[PDB]
Amino acid sequence: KSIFYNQVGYLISGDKRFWIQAHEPQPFALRTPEGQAVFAGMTKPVGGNWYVGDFTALRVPGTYTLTVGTLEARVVIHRRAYRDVLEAMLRFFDYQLCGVVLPEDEAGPWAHGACHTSDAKVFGTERALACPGGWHDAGDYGKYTVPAAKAVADLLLAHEYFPAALAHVRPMRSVHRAPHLPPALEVAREEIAWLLTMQDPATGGVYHKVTTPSFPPLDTRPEDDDAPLVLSPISYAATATFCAAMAHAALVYRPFDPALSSCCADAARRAYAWLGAHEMQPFHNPDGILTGEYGDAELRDELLWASCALLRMTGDSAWARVCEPLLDLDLPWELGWADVALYGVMDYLRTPRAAVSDDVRNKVKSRLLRELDALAAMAESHPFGIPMRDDDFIWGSNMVLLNRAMAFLLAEGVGVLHPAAHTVAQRAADYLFGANPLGQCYVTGFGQRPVRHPHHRPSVADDVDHPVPGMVVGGPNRHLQDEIARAQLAGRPAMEAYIDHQDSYSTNEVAVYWNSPAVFVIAALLEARGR
Ligand SMILES: [Ca+2]
Ligand SMILES: [Zn+2]
């Protein structure tokens, strides 16, 4: 029996909520460390087994003792409560850097020399290509184009939406080149640079991934992983998502890195040329390649994103002829990594009105609003106020949640101002930081119940009780898709289908594209912005 709360903290100007399992209202108090009450109220029912207490009106920063029944919790209120965790979430990307020295003065215990420095062989050939840099994808050391595109897009969108919040954090600054770009762009450039090396100069197509044939032991340090690197074949999905990300990067970097901006624009155009001359073939692992497939049978949303990205990059109305029929399809409007249509919708909506059809544009805005309404109804039913149903708690459920919060916030940039947007964002953070049935903070290195045993090779290699901080784990997954989950979590409700165990890859791994929406959402919460 405990209090469930945001274990990282609460914003002075933000909503403040705790949860408890109870069957009737109870008085609660918030007190100073000496013990004197500064706030008091009554809990109220929200369904399932749950009651909530609202202490939003407490505006004075500090560490308070929350008392309800015979239970106590320590809660922090601060002007920028999430600054440290946002910084850690962004530093994760630098911790994932491949082929670059990470010095101890930046990386502490996890400092290491440049890893995976060898040339990658193109599958089914004797040709070798240098594809250095960028990020290890997850708990493994593969670098995969499709999910990379999402992580880049999310960081770029965070820079575009919340630059002031991001300005207050510091990545591994000394590992990046001077002059230093704004934090999100400094970090994202490393991945963008690597992506550019994955494009085949002859055809404009993009290799699906570069990995070793198989996964090394969970125990393996990055610099000790010396198996041969293989470039898996060019794929439609990789080429299209590369196109979209590069087109996005072209726009965003224009005033910061003109050479990169220009390089990305032309790379995007060459990638789109490839799309036009090739079939929408889903990617499957070649024989002898057992690493992450990142497959996907539906590719029209990738074409949609690429098309809309180039529409916005160029501002040329000719692109709307291709975009608008794709926007009419009943594709899910989601934020990846496989279902990427909402990135395209956003690029379309963020293009000057003059370049697109007014009729189509209003239909797209209207669909977006209806989608958000649906998510808002979900959140209203849920005891923790998050836009989730039991069946949404799948592999990477934390990302499912964060993408949904992100959609609310993105919409505010294109004239769709849903009244639940900022409540949803706060509840998503609350949930991520311990306001859930397990009382689990789903980020390593933070909260009172942090993640301690992530499925992450650098963490497992160094200290299995003390992992790299700032890593957002996948979260509860009702499908029990690893040995540990099957054995330990059968019969538990959806939100309880998580275990902090290094072998539980289906509930407790990490990913660049799980940190990326988290950076966006937490940055939004820091940029406190009503009248
Ligand atoms: Ca797709
Ligand atoms: Zn590496």
GROMACS .gro file of N, CA and C in nm, residues 139-141 215-221 453-462 464 501-505 509:
model
   81
  139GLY      N    1   1.902  -0.138  -2.697
  139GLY     CA    2   1.992  -0.212  -2.608
  139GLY      C    3   2.104  -0.282  -2.683
  140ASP      N    4   2.092  -0.288  -2.816
  140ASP     CA    5   2.192  -0.345  -2.906
  140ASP      C    6   2.274  -0.234  -2.974
  141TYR      N    7   2.356  -0.273  -3.072
  141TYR     CA    8   2.447  -0.179  -3.137
  141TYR      C    9   2.418  -0.158  -3.284
  215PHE      N   10   2.317  -1.059  -3.279
  215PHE     CA   11   2.335  -0.982  -3.157
  215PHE      C   12   2.447  -1.040  -3.072
  216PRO      N   13   2.534  -0.954  -3.015
  216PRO     CA   14   2.636  -1.005  -2.924
  216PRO      C   15   2.576  -1.033  -2.786
  217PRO      N   16   2.652  -1.101  -2.698
  217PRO     CA   17   2.603  -1.121  -2.562
  217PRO      C   18   2.558  -0.990  -2.493
  218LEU      N   19   2.459  -0.999  -2.405
  218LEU     CA   20   2.407  -0.882  -2.331
  218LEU      C   21   2.521  -0.812  -2.257
  219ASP      N   22   2.627  -0.888  -2.236
  219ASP     CA   23   2.743  -0.853  -2.156
  219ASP      C   24   2.844  -0.763  -2.229
  220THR      N   25   2.827  -0.748  -2.360
  220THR     CA   26   2.931  -0.692  -2.445
  220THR      C   27   2.940  -0.540  -2.441
  221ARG      N   28   3.060  -0.490  -2.411
  221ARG     CA   29   3.090  -0.349  -2.422
  221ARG      C   30   3.096  -0.309  -2.570
  453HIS      N   31   1.762  -0.214  -1.398
  453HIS     CA   32   1.817  -0.328  -1.472
  453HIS      C   33   1.768  -0.330  -1.615
  454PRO      N   34   1.795  -0.222  -1.692
  454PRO     CA   35   1.743  -0.218  -1.828
  454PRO      C   36   1.812  -0.318  -1.921
  455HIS      N   37   1.740  -0.362  -2.024
  455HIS     CA   38   1.798  -0.445  -2.128
  455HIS      C   39   1.880  -0.355  -2.222
  456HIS      N   40   2.004  -0.329  -2.182
  456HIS     CA   41   2.090  -0.229  -2.247
  456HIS      C   42   2.235  -0.271  -2.224
  457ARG      N   43   2.304  -0.306  -2.332
  457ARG     CA   44   2.436  -0.369  -2.323
  457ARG      C   45   2.541  -0.287  -2.248
  458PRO      N   46   2.554  -0.156  -2.279
  458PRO     CA   47   2.650  -0.076  -2.200
  458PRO      C   48   2.622  -0.072  -2.050
  459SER      N   49   2.495  -0.076  -2.011
  459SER     CA   50   2.458  -0.077  -1.869
  459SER      C   51   2.487  -0.212  -1.806
  460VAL      N   52   2.447  -0.319  -1.875
  460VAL     CA   53   2.470  -0.455  -1.828
  460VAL      C   54   2.620  -0.484  -1.818
  461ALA      N   55   2.696  -0.440  -1.918
  461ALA     CA   56   2.842  -0.458  -1.919
  461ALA      C   57   2.913  -0.391  -1.800
  462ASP      N   58   2.867  -0.272  -1.760
  462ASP     CA   59   2.933  -0.194  -1.654
  462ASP      C   60   2.885  -0.227  -1.512
  464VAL      N   61   2.511  -0.382  -1.340
  464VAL     CA   62   2.375  -0.430  -1.360
  464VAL      C   63   2.273  -0.370  -1.260
  501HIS      N   64   1.391  -0.614  -1.521
  501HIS     CA   65   1.480  -0.729  -1.532
  501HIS      C   66   1.558  -0.714  -1.663
  502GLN      N   67   1.688  -0.739  -1.659
  502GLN     CA   68   1.775  -0.711  -1.775
  502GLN      C   69   1.744  -0.800  -1.896
  503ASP      N   70   1.682  -0.915  -1.870
  503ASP     CA   71   1.647  -1.008  -1.975
  503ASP      C   72   1.508  -0.982  -2.034
  504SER      N   73   1.430  -0.896  -1.970
  504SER     CA   74   1.297  -0.862  -2.022
  504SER      C   75   1.305  -0.756  -2.132
  505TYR      N   76   1.346  -0.799  -2.251
  505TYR     CA   77   1.360  -0.705  -2.364
  505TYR      C   78   1.226  -0.650  -2.414
  509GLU      N   79   1.356  -0.279  -2.241
  509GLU     CA   80   1.463  -0.229  -2.327
  509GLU      C   81   1.446  -0.078  -2.342
   0.00000   0.00000   0.00000
